[PDB]
Amino acid sequence: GLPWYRVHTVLINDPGRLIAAHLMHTALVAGWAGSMALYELATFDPSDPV
Amino acid sequence: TLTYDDIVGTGLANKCPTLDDTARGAYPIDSSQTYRIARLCLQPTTFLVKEEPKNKRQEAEFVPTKLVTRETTSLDQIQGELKVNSDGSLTFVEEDGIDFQPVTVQMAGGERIPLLFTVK
Ligand code: CLA
Ligand code: CLA
Ligand code: CLA
Ligand code: CLA
Ligand SMILES: CC1=C(/C=C/C(C)=C/C=C/C(C)=C/C=C/C=C(C)/C=C/C=C(C)/C=C/C2=C(C)CCCC2(C)C)C(C)(C)CCC1
Ligand SMILES: CCCCCCCCCCCCO[C@@H]1O[C@H](CO)[C@@H](O[C@H]2O[C@H](CO)[C@@H](O)[C@H](O)[C@H]2O)[C@H](O)[C@H]1O
């Protein structure tokens, strides 16, 4: 048993599975990035900037 | 010169009659003779839609809009007598013709404004 709060330790020396991990975080933050954008475009009212 | 198989599809059928830069002439109005208008054409080019008041009474302007239909805008074949009543002024009286076209333009924001472009 490895504790749950350590599961991600399996990468401390796997530059491949680390870059793989890091690649997935970036991918998610972009998803969210454009994701958010769309949500806002789908609800932003431009009719009055005053 | 240009015929149907000559205009079909070119969309020239919507644009109407031009006068080569030779104009600036003067069509003598007899007054002792009755005049009529054979063909009066009206070709739309730009449509504007006064931005609904903001509520805040601050002079609303007419903004441009995108034509969501196609080249189905021109009024043509319009005719009627060009009456020459006293004091030299002319008065055209529309009698009949393709004097109306349902146009729909997509506005700046998102809306779609359908109007009945006419001169009935
Ligand atoms: C810069 C980013 C960063 C990175 C890459 C790491 C990386 C690491 N941390 Mg560290 N950590 C960080 C920031 C970071 N930490 C911060 C800011 C704190 C203070 C809160 C800590 C506190 C901390 C502790 C106390 C421990 C680690 C441990 C570890 C190692 C294993 C992690 C694990 O098992 O996760 C697996 C985790 C889970 C199964 C639970 C996740 C639960 C949270 C509450 C859910 C939140 C979810 C949500 C999606 C997150 C959004 C993130 C937000 C910032 C946008 C790993 C090397 C462990 C270690 O050293 O192991 C020997 C360990 O015990 N970290
Ligand atoms: C030639 C020089 C060089 C360059 C330009 C980079 C560039 C980069 N490194 Mg790498 N690195 C290098 C040498 C280099 N490294 C060496 C010698 C090592 C030791 C083995 C490492 C070890 C290393 C680690 C351990 C990590 C990085 C990471 C990263 C990225 C961080 C920023 C990011 O994620 O942007 C976000 C992405 C973009 C918007 C850019 C996408 C476009 C790229 C440039 C093209 C990808 C296609 C190309 C054909 C193949 C990849 C080439 C590779 C050299 C990067 C970035 C792309 C991190 C990572 O994994 O990133 C996710 C990371 O954790 N690097
Ligand atoms: C520069 C800014 C930045 C930084 C430094 C980080 C850093 C981190 N991110 Mg985050 N992320 C960011 C921006 C950033 N992110 C953005 C803009 C998004 C888009 C919304 C995400 C989305 C994201 C996701 C979807 C995931 C991460 C995860 C992670 C952690 C991965 C490593 C790890 O194992 O941690 C170990 C864990 C920790 C120390 C996290 C606790 C720290 C935060 C601050 C607490 C948040 C509190 C939370 C609401 C309380 C829940 C409690 C629970 C009991 C109910 C790391 C702490 C992964 C993760 O946390 O999985 C384990 C993950 O799945 N990030
Ligand atoms: C390919 C390149 C690329 C480009 C051109 C953009 C462009 C944009 N992004 Mg996206 N983004 C990218 C990749 C890219 N992104 C990637 C790979 C991710 C992760 C998946 C994201 C995640 C992301 C998020 C989460 C968000 C954006 C947002 C935005 C918009 C502007 C926001 C802003 O002001 O950021 C400014 C950023 C910074 C302050 C970065 C500089 C960081 C510090 C100051 C420097 C640290 C430097 C370090 C210490 C080195 C030393 C420096 C040395 C010279 C001395 C902009 C359209 C925002 C938006 O509006 O969403 C639509 C937003 O919220 N992006
Ligand atoms: C099968 C196949 C394939 C593949 C696949 C792939 C590659 C996939 C991917 C996938 C993916 C990649 C997926 C993803 C998913 C996602 C999700 C599921 C998300 C979600 C999200 C959310 C839920 C959100 C939210 C929100 C809101 C609500 C608002 C605000 C903002 C936000 C956005 C945050 C190929 C092409 C080869 C071909 C053959 C077939
Ligand atoms: C090929 C790359 C593709 C990239 C992704 C592009 C996606 C573009 C989506 C943008 C977000 C649209 O968000 C959506 O906007 C339209 C207006 O335009 C809104 O439409 C709203 O006003 C129109 C009138 O203008 C009403 O007829 C409609 O019933 C009402 O919901 C939607 O309520 C909103 O949910």
Curated annotation (Swiss-Prot), chain B:
One of the extrinsic, lumenal subunits of photosystem II (PSII), which stabilize and protect the oxygen-evolving complex. PSII is a light-driven water plastoquinone oxidoreductase, using light energy to abstract electrons from H(2)O, generating a proton gradient subsequently used for ATP formation. Required for dimerization of PSII and for binding of PsbQ to PSII. This is Photosystem II extrinsic protein O. It comes from Thermosynechococcus vestitus (strain NIES-2133 / IAM M-273 / BP-1). Belongs to the PsbO family. PSII is composed of 1 copy each of membrane proteins PsbA, PsbB, PsbC, PsbD, PsbE, PsbF, PsbH, PsbI, PsbJ, PsbK, PsbL, PsbM, PsbT, PsbX, PsbY, PsbZ, Psb30/Ycf12, peripheral proteins PsbO, CyanoQ (PsbQ), PsbU, PsbV and a large number of cofactors. It forms dimeric complexes. It is found in: Cellular thylakoid membrane.
